[PDB]
Each structure stands twice: as structure tokens, then as C-alpha cells.
Ligand SMILES: COc1ccc(C(=O)CN2C(=O)NC(c3ccccc3)(c3ccccc3)C2=O)cc1
Ligand SMILES: COc1ccc(C(=O)CN2C(=O)NC(c3ccccc3)(c3ccccc3)C2=O)cc1
């Protein structure tokens with residue numbers, strides 16, 4: 198149902214069954230499907246399409262010409278009732294596309310909270326975007342991509358299907374990411390290669406000097422020691438016995454399927 | 461006229477003279493010009509602009525914020541009544557742009573059937589897209605570009621004006637194609653260079669082992685023999701005397717104007 | 724107020740306080756904010772959002788799904804009443820985004836006259852675009868970017884924040900510009916590097932043979948002499964004592980903050 202304190206523009210079309218929370222705002226020429234849930238305080242500026250089985254949280258701002266929940270572009274998708282989940286306080290700018298999952302991929306495309314999704318950013322079927330991320334203009338996630346917390350993806354950058362963008366990563370603009378990017382790393386180029394630890398981001402987010410140093414040492418194990426990833430895995434787990442921030446590497450290794458970006 | 465079995469949303473604006481076929485669906489806030497023809501069963505989801513002298517076939521799906529038939533971006537275009545032709549069973553996703561031709565270019569932008577045109581794909585004036593193609597997100601065809609049957613263009617890839625993308629080609633994402641790509645070839649990079657025969661695609665599309673081998677040999681003639689294209693042209697026509705699939709090269713050579721992509 | 728000779732489509736929403744000039748045309752499903760000024764003869768085709776403190780001049784054409792004046796994407800912006808200025812006779816194609824300034828950046832995003840802004844071109848907060856420019860499909864200006872008169876930016880090209888694109892520059896498509904581009908120069912690649920003087924453009928725009936030669940000599944001073952920019956600055960000012968066209972370099976040097984693109 199539509200909360201009595203929500204606003205639906207007379208020109209918007211909210212189909213029966215849609216759930217609109219208190220003090221939400223559905224602007225002019227919006228289309229909201231019958232399986233959509235829009236949380237308290239969320240704003241659809243105008244000309245927004247939201248359909249499918251789509252759950253949107255609180256205090257989001259979705260700008261004109263965005264397409265949220267829409268049928269995905271996977272070649273095998275056949276209309277199965279998959280899902281989209283979007284959290285809270287996200288800013289979803291003009292022409293962003295966020296597509297529903299595929300049965301084969303797990304049925305869910307998920308976006309966290311406090312993200313900035315810039316003009317024409319694309320979140321393909323079965324992607325998982327975390328919290329406090331930034332996807333710049335025209336940043337494109339192919340199917341099944343994970344972008345972990347605080348990760349930043351520069352403008353005009355594409356992420357190859359199934360890849361993982363680790364937490365606190367920064368991918369420079371105009372890059373093509375064809376493999377997995379470990380947490381805390383700067384990547385850039387096409388194909389993208391690693392350019393060290395995102396020190397400035399770790400600074401600004403309150404990482405201690407000891408944590409940044411341990412992370413930098415974990416970086417050197419992976420990329421400078423010359424040892425294989427299998428040799429360095431216990432060495433990094435060892436270092437994480439003292440510096441818990443280094444565990445992000447261990448958890449990341451367990452999920453990686455396409456290998457790490459390398460130079 | 462509008463067929464009695466077609467649906468036009470009360471908020472859509474279909475101008476007098478438009479031709480809407482049986483069981484077509486013009487969704488909310490669509491704009492359909494007086495010279496537009498939309499074939500049986502085609503769906504305009506919502507917020508779709510279709511204008512100019514534009515013929516659209518059967519069972520197409522055109523998603524919100526697409527612009528079909530619109531004035532092209534050629535610097536000399538001056539409003540002449542050029543045309544767009546689109547065939548059947550195409551999926552034209554959010555924000556795709558397909559622009560009318562130019563007098564100088566021949567007056568026609570043409571798209572075949574069974575194509576998937578992903579988010580923000582661009583088909584410039586005077587382009588010819590064949591059947592069963594895929595243009596991924598942000599794939600951009602400049603003016604006068606040909607994309608032949610089954611060709612696939614990866615996301616964020618641009619094709620330079622007048623270039624030809626041969627049949628069964630695969631262009632990797634994040635690539636810039638500045639010259640013609642022969643049939644059956646994989647291209648990638650920026651500028652794009654050839655990376656062999658698209659064997660997997662030829663497999664999946666029912667090419668025989670003999671056909672793939674002859675094609676691979678035609679590839680080696682062009683790119684490994686060291687002979688000039690003029691020397692290899694009769695050698696490829698010779699090989700096509702036995703393997704008709706190799707004729708695609710001959711027909712492609714007759715159309716190529718910008719030279720082949722080379723390494 | 725809305726001029727008696729202006730046309731506002733019954734489905735458009737022009738908020739009280741908007742200023743619409745004579746023989747302007749606000750098409751279907753457009754949204755025009757109360758602080759917007761639209762000059763004589765300007766056309767909003769359909770599905771156009773224009774808001775904020777936005778001044779738009781005469782004889783512009785703004786195509787469907789464009790977002791003009793909208794809140795910028797700068798991470799510190801907090802809703803301050805910044806501004807957009809757009810001049811005359813601009814063609815602003817589908818899905819173009821032009822965002823308002825930031826207090827910190829000077830409060831103004833400005834676009835000149837006689838520009839062609841192609842599909843999905845982006846003009847970030849605090850940018851200055853001059854006169855007679857071309858931004859091709861998906862050309863993206865980050866914040867605080869200047870694009871000087873007659874400059875052309877190829878499709879899928881991004882300009883890094885704070886950079887200057889000099890007058891009569893040509894940036895090839897699929898390029899990433901991370902530093903300032905001097906007037907009259909061709910740039911291309913990623914990162915973009917200089918490829919000589921834009922001779923053909925200077926030809927077509929009426930530059931004399933003497934002017935092109937002096938410009939070419941100024942190019943060689945910067946990029947071939949091997950001298951530092953500080954050594955060449957008085958040499959270029961010297962050459963400009965005879966060839967006033969060379970002064971564009973001097974004025975450009977005074978504004979450059981990110982260094983010149985180099986090979
Ligand atoms: C070297 O740096 C990079 C970076 C990114 C990529 C890619 O994204 C490559 N790529 C997919 O992984 N899926 C895509 C697709 C295209 C055609 C047919 C099937 C699947 C795709 C992309 C975006 C949206 C939708 C579909 C596609 O082009 C490649 C290389
Ligand atoms: C090395 O790899 C590549 C791949 C692709 C390209 C290009 O596409 C280069 N290029 C055109 O051929 N026409 C464009 C244009 C821009 C400015 C003025 C006139 C024409 C264009 C592109 C797309 C849509 C509309 C217009 C443009 O930028 C270049 C290099």
C-alpha cells in the first residue's frame with residue numbers, strides 16, 4: 198500500500214500492490230511496478246522506471262531516466278521472477294541501470310547503502326555492490342560482479358563478468374578490469390594492473406599507521422616477493438594474526454575465481 | 461492507422477498517420493511520429509521516442525528512454541527526409557539511439573532482425589546492422605558503419621566511421637576499431653588488432669570442422685603468410701572453390717574501404 | 724513569465740517563475756524549474772529536465788532525456804544555489820547531462836554558443852565550454868574542466884578534472900586526457916599524448932599559411948626543442964610579437980595547472 202504521508206505525482210503510474218513508505222516522493226512520469234517496495238523517505242525525481250521484484254530502502258535519491266529492477270541483458274534470461282535489493286541513502290543518478298538477477302546466477306542483484314552511482318553507471322544481473330562505493334560516469338559492471346565496501350570505480354571503466362573488486366579499491370578511469378582486484382589496491386589501465394595500496398583512502402577512512410603498513414606488506418607478499426599465491430596465502434594469514442585488517446585478503450582469496458590482476 | 465488489437469497507452473502520443481500493427485503495445489509516455497510504422501506485436505515499454513520516416517518490424521521490444529529514427533548527428537545533415545529500417549524480434553534496451561540516414565550517405569540507417577542492442581548502444585546515420593548481432597553497453601557505431609551477421613561488439617567499444625565489422629566477428633570490450641575487421645575474426649585493443657578466428661562462435665553456430673579449418677587457413681593467408689592482400693585474394697578465392705564459407709572473405713574484400721585491422 | 728508566442732505542451736510541467744521566451748517550444752513531458760530561463764526560439768523536444776538556477780539562450784535544441792542544470796555529482800556539494808549558463812544555437816542531443824557548479828569551484832557551469840553536444844556527453848560542475856565546440860558520444864568532462872573555442876573531443880573520451888582543452892584542439896576518440904592540451908594540438912591515446920598541430924582544422928577555419936607555420940613552430944618549441952616550458956615561454960611570446968595567433972599559447976600557459984600532455 199501507499200503510505201498516507203507519501204506523495205505520488207498525479208502523472209506517475211504506481212501499480213496496485215506497490216509498497217510506498219512514509220514521506221517517500223514519486224515524481225512526475227515515474228512508473229512503479231506492482232512488486233516494488235520503496236522505503237521511507239526515498240525520492241524518485243521524475244521519469245524513473247522501477248519494476249520487477251524490487252526492494253528499495255530508505256532515503257534514496259533516484260534521478261530521472263534511471264531504470265531500476267528492469268529485465269537483465271543475460272542471453273539466457275527468459276523472464277524468471279528474479280530480484281533486486283537496494284539499501285539506504287543511495288544516490289542513483291541520471292540514466293543508471295540496475296537489472297534483476299538470473300536464476301543461474303542466484304536470482305539476486307544487490308546494492309548496499311550510502312553508494313553514489315553516477316550518470317549511466319550499469320549494475321548487471323547478479324551483481325553485488327556493497328556500502329559506501331562510488332561508480333563514476335559510464336562505469337559498467339558485467340554480470341556476476343562484486344564490488345566491495347568503499348571501492349571506487351573511475352569513469353568509463355568496465356569490469357569483466359564474475360570479477361571481484363575488493364574493499365577500499367580504487368580503479369582509475371578509462372580502465373578495463375579483466376581479473377579480480379584484491380582489497381586496498383589501486384588499479385588502472387586496460388587491461389588493469391595493480392599500482393600499489395590505496396594509502397590516501399585508508400588514511401581518510403581511519404586506518405592506523407600499523408594497519409596501512411601491514412596492508413602494504415601484504416601487498417608486497419602478493420606482488421613483490423615473487424612467491425606464488427599459494428605460498429603467500431599462509432604468510433598473509435600469519436600477518437593477519439596480528440593485524441586483523443589483513444584478513445580482508447584472506448576472505449577475498451576465498452571468493453576470487455578469475456585470478457588476481459597482475460603486471 | 462492503429463490496428464484495433466493494438467494498445468496505445470492513454471498517456472502516449474501517437475500522431476495521426478502512424479501505422480501500428482496488430483497486438484502492438486505503445487506504453488506510457490511514448491511519442492510516435494506520423495511517419496512511423498510499428499509492426500505486429502512490437503512493444504514500446506515506456507518513455508520511447510520514435511519519429512522520422514521509420515519502419516519497425518514484428519515482435520521487437522524497445523525499452524524506456526530509447527530514441528529511434530531521431531535526427532542524426534552528422535554535421536552536414538540539414539533535415540532531409542532520410543529513413544530508418546528495423547526488422548523483427550530485436551531487443552533494443554534502455555537509452556539506445558538509432559539515427560536516420562544522410563542524403564550523402566545513401567539516406568538509410570538499417571538494422572536487421574534478432575539483434576540485441578544493449579544499454580546506450582549507438583547506431584549512427586547510414587549504418588547497416590545485420591541479423592543476430594550483439595552490441596553491448598555503450599557500444600558506439602560512428603556514421604556509415606556496417607556490422608555483419610552474428611558479429612558481437614563488446615561493451616564500451618567504438619567503431620570508427622565507414623568501418624566494416626565482418627560476419628561472426630567478436631570485438632572485445634574496451635576496444636577502438638579504426639579499420640575493417642574480416643569475417644570470423646576476434647579483435648580487441650585500442651586500436652583493435654586481430655587475435656585469430658572466433659572458433660567458439662563458429663562451433664556454436666554449426667560450422668563444420670572442415671569449414672573452421674579452411675577459415676583458419678584463410679586467416680593465416682591474410683595475417684601469417686606475409687603476402688600482400690592482393691597476392692592472397694586469389695589464394696582465398698581458390699580455397700573458397702572447395703569451402704564456400706571462405707567466400708565471406710571475398711565478399712568482404714569487395715566492400716572494405718579502410719584496410720584490414722593488422723598487428 | 725511565459726511569452727504569449729511560446730508553446731508549452733499540455734503534458735509539460737513549467738513551474739511558476741520560469742521564464743520562457745518568444746517562439747520557444749517546451750515539448751511533451753518536459754520539466755522546467757521555477758529558476759530556469761529559456762531564451763527566444765529554444766526547443767525542448769520532449770522528456771527534458773531543466774532545473775536549478777539555469778539560463779539558456781536563443782535557438783537551442785535540447786533533445787529527449789537530457790538533464791540540464793541538475794545537481795552536480797561533486798562529493799562535497801550540499802545543495803547550495805549554484806548556476807548553469809548556456810548560450811545560443813547549441814544542439815544538445817539525447818541524454819546529455821550538464822550539472823550546476825559548486826561553491827568551491829566558483830558556482831558556475833558555463834557553455835557557450837554554437838556547440839554540438841552529442842549523445843550522453845557530460846559537462847560536470849564548474850566546467851567552462853566555449854563556442855563552436857564538439858563533444859562526441861559519451862565524451863565526459865570531469866569537474867572544473869575548460870574546453871576552449873572550436874575544440875573537438877572524440878567519442879568515449881574522458882577529460883580528467885581541472886584539465887584545459889585548448890582552442891582548436893582535436894582529441895581523438897577512445898582517449899583519456901589527464902593533463903592540459905595546448906591550443907591547436909591533436910591529442911589521442913590513454914593517457915593522451917600530442918600528435919602535432921590540427922592543420923586541417925586551422926585550414927578550414929581560415930588560418931593563413933603564415934599563422935599555421937608560426938603555430939607549428941610554437942609546437943616545435945614546446946615539444947621538439949628539448950627546452951623546458953619556462954625557457955620556451957619567452958620564445959613563444961617573442962614569436963607572437965609577429966604572429967598574434969601564437970598568443971593563444973601564452974594565454975593558455977597562464978591558465979594551465981596540470982602541466983601539458985607530453986610523450
Ligand atoms: C579488458 O578489460 C575489460 C573490461 C570489461 C570487459 C567486459 O565487460 C566484456 N564483457 C562481459 O564480460 N560481458 C559483456 C557481454 C558482451 C557481449 C555478449 C555477452 C556479454 C557485457 C558487458 C557489459 C554489459 C553487458 C554485457 C562484455 O562485453 C572486457 C574487458
Ligand atoms: C582508435 O579507435 C577508434 C574508434 C572509434 C573512433 C571514432 O568513432 C572517431 N569518431 C568518428 O569516426 N566519428 C565521431 C566524430 C566526432 C567528432 C566530430 C565528428 C565525428 C563520432 C563518434 C561517435 C558518434 C558520433 C561521432 C568520432 O569521434 C576513433 C578511434
Ligand SMILES: COc1ccc(C(=O)CN2C(=O)NC(c3ccccc3)(c3ccccc3)C2=O)cc1
Nearest residue numbers: 333334351352370865881882883884899900901914
Ligand atoms: C588517464 O585518462 C583519464 C581521463 C579521465 C579521468 C577521470 O575523469 C578521473 N576522474 C575524475 O577526474 N573525476 C571522476 C571521479 C570518480 C570517482 C570519484 C571522484 C571523481 C569523475 C569522472 C567523470 C564524472 C564524474 C566524476 C573520475 O573518475 C581519469 C583518467
